[PDB]
Amino acid sequence: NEDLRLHLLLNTSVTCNDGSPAGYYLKESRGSRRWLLFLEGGWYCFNRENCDSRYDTMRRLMSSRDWPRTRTGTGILSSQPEENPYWWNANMVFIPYCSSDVWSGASSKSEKNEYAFMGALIIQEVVRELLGRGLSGAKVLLLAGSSAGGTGVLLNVDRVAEQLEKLGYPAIQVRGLADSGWFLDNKQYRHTDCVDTITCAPTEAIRRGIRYWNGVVPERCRRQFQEGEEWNCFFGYKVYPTLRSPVFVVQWLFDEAQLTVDNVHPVQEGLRLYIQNLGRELRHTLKDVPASFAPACLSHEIIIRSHWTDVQVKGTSLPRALHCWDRSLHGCPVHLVDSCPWPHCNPSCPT
Ligand SMILES: O=S(=O)(O)OC[C@H]1O[C@@](COS(=O)(=O)O)(O[C@H]2O[C@H](COS(=O)(=O)O)[C@@H](OS(=O)(=O)O)[C@H](OS(=O)(=O)O)[C@H]2OS(=O)(=O)O)[C@@H](OS(=O)(=O)O)[C@@H]1OS(=O)(=O)O
Ligand SMILES: *[C@@H]1O[C@H](CO)[C@@H](O)[C@H](O)[C@H]1NC(C)=O
Ligand SMILES: [Cl-]
């Protein structure tokens, strides 16, 4: 009874990679006008061979066929006030990641093509369906997501805001929370052939991906870059400046996924400097992001983990930082970035 319940999209042309219906999990809180829509992450695949291995080995991320009927909300999706001090009573939605496209895909596939990439269409579908189940009464819609879902937020939040403005819902304030989705298009520590998904350099992964997924990026970002250079917009620091919606960025200064795509594994001095500098460059990209939480840890994702309340930056927890931000949009710091130079120089890093 306390769990989020699955609904498969009515529009059966909007699908996961394998053509099974996409969907969303929902727990209504009928006395609340706040809505949390969470986009799941889990990498991506950018060519046929790699999508084949992902289908063999990680079918969950390509198909709805085995999704369970319900799932328990955790972290910012929990309905327990101890676990979720300020958002426990919100309406909760979890949108599973079954498009492998960083939530960017916007075409119905060709029959010639074998996988469908419909991440951007899923989100809009889910939003439309929600309108008939309570979202029509919302005042705040926080679009949140972790890892590829955090990148998804940056790519989709202004489109959700535009969609709701266009459909006649001017009172719904659309906001984003991007967790572990803020990446650097940097040079790898040691350069790889781009042969597996997880070790392909981040610039090349998106360059290929965007073409393979027929991915879309926010128009205001696309305009800033030359034709063919849309890949730039998958990078938080490049897409953020033109976002109209308020967006709170949560980012570990040493994200495990960043180190993975940078082909990084007492460390030798070259490797020490590359790591320190990675932390430094990330810190620098967050300088002009007033609402951010960036601890000096090597970790990945946080907002739906049960222990998300434990990490602190300058004495402030993440749920508290987020509450300060909420209050500012409706003494309470919202800009919280570690300055220490090595992973786990913050005592409160998760394990
Ligand atoms: O349980 S809820 O999910 O509805 O959230 C309750 C808390 O939401 C706030 C917003 O907090 S903030 O975003 O951090 O700033 O306000 C919302 O609830 C209050 C009180 O409603 S309640 O049923 O008595 O809890 C609403 O006020 S009122 O309509 O009853 O006058 C706010 O609506 S409004 O701004 O007046 O339109 C409502 O905001 S919203 O509609 O969700 O955007 C907190 O209240 S606040 O501190 O006054 O801003 C609530 O905190 S509380 O301790 O639970 O009261
Ligand atoms: C179903 O979604 C498909 C693919 O996006 C779209 O072409 C079609 O218009 C949709 N139909 C309805 C009735 O929503
Ligand atoms: Cl129902």
Side-chain angles (χ1 to χ4, degrees):
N1 55 70
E2 273 269 272
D3 278 6
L4 286 74
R5 307 193 301 108
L6 180 55
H7 304 275
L8 297 177
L9 303 172
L10 296 191
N11 189 348
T12 196
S13 307
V14 178
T15 75
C16 298
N17 290 133
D18 65 350
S20 58
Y24 59 98
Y25 291 85
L26 170 62
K27 193 200 177 168
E28 319 91 333
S29 191
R30 298 151 193 288
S32 177
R33 293 198 301 177
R34 293 147 83 221
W35 281 77
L36 192 133
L37 267 57
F38 173 87
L39 300 183
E40 189 183 28
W43 293 91
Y44 43 72
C45 59
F46 55 66
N47 60 36
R48 196 78 205 318
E49 321 83 272
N50 294 159
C51 288
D52 286 341
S53 316
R54 180 182 179 86
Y55 198 67
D56 301 318
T57 305
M58 295 165 268
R59 196 151 302 174
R60 177 177 56 81
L61 295 169
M62 295 190 69
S63 187
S64 56
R65 287 210 308 164
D66 297 340
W67 291 355
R69 187 180 57 83
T70 62
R71 68 184 288 128
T72 300
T74 59
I76 201 168
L77 294 174
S78 173
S79 284
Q80 310 313 289
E82 292 324 297
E83 185 173 358
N84 190 11
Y86 302 106
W87 274 72
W88 72 270
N89 197 42
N91 295 270
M92 297 312 180
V93 175
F94 182 104
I95 316 178
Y97 182 42
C98 69
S99 53
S100 306
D101 58 357
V102 205
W103 299 93
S104 73
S107 305
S108 320
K109 82 170 180 83
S110 282
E111 306 318 282
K112 299 160 209 170
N113 295 323
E114 285 323 307
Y115 297 109
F117 299 97
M118 313 188 83
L121 297 169
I122 291 165
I123 286 168
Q124 308 270 259
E125 198 66 42
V126 169
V127 171
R128 296 207 300 276
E129 285 212 19
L130 291 180
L131 287 173
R133 300 171 170 278
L135 178 74
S136 42
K139 289 220 70 219
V140 178
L141 184 186
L142 173 59
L143 179 63
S146 295
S147 75
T151 310
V153 168
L154 302 166
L155 292 176
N156 286 284
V157 69
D158 281 5
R159 189 157 305 104
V160 169
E162 288 158 348
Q163 176 194 15
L164 292 165
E165 165 150 28
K166 272 212 159 175
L167 299 183
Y169 292 96
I172 301 181
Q173 303 163 248
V174 181
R175 302 172 194 171
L177 168 53
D179 167 28
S180 266
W182 184 277
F183 295 109
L184 302 182
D185 56 325
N186 62 342
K187 299 229 273 248
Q188 296 181 301
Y189 171 59
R190 298 271 178 269
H191 187 44
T192 72
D193 25 33
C194 166
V195 46
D196 285 302
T197 299
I198 60 71
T199 55
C200 182
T203 311
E204 183 59 9
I206 306 304
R207 286 184 131 129
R208 297 182 181 206
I210 193 169
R211 300 174 60 100
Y212 194 66
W213 309 317
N214 288 291
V216 294
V217 298
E219 194 274 343
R220 285 192 230 82
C221 183
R222 182 201 312 132
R223 263 176 6 209
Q224 291 193 319
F225 292 95
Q226 292 178 49
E227 177 112 28
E229 293 315 283
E230 291 84 7
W231 66 261
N232 278 278
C233 298
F234 281 70
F235 294 84
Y237 79 101
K238 295 172 161 174
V239 60
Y240 183 88
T242 60
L243 290 167
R244 251 137 119 160
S245 299
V247 171
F248 194 108
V249 174
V250 184
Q251 191 55 50
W252 303 115
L253 291 178
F254 315 96
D255 187 287
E256 291 184 295
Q258 182 73 60
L259 289 187
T260 299
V261 304
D262 288 333
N263 190 22
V264 166
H265 311 300
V267 51
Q268 271 177 31
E269 192 68 339
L271 183 50
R272 185 178 72 79
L273 298 176
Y274 181 94
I275 289 165
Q276 279 190 326
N277 180 75
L278 175 65
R280 211 155 46 236
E281 287 170 341
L282 208 56
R283 178 170 350 106
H284 172 86
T285 62
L286 296 171
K287 195 215 318 268
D288 295 324
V289 183
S292 58
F293 188 93
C297 315
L298 169 78
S299 188
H300 194 47
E301 303 187 321
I302 182 176
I303 63 172
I304 63 161
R305 305 189 178 282
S306 291
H307 308 315
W308 78 302
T309 49
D310 298 341
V311 63
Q312 287 204 311
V313 173
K314 291 165 164 79
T316 306
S317 74
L318 172 52
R320 172 90 180 310
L322 288 172
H323 175 70
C324 297
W325 179 60
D326 299 354
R327 293 266 84 215
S328 79
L329 298 176
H330 186 90
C332 231
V334 302
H335 187 87
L336 292 168
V337 174
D338 269 334
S339 57
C340 59
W342 193 254
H344 213 311
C345 54
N346 183 320
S348 70
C349 294
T351 89

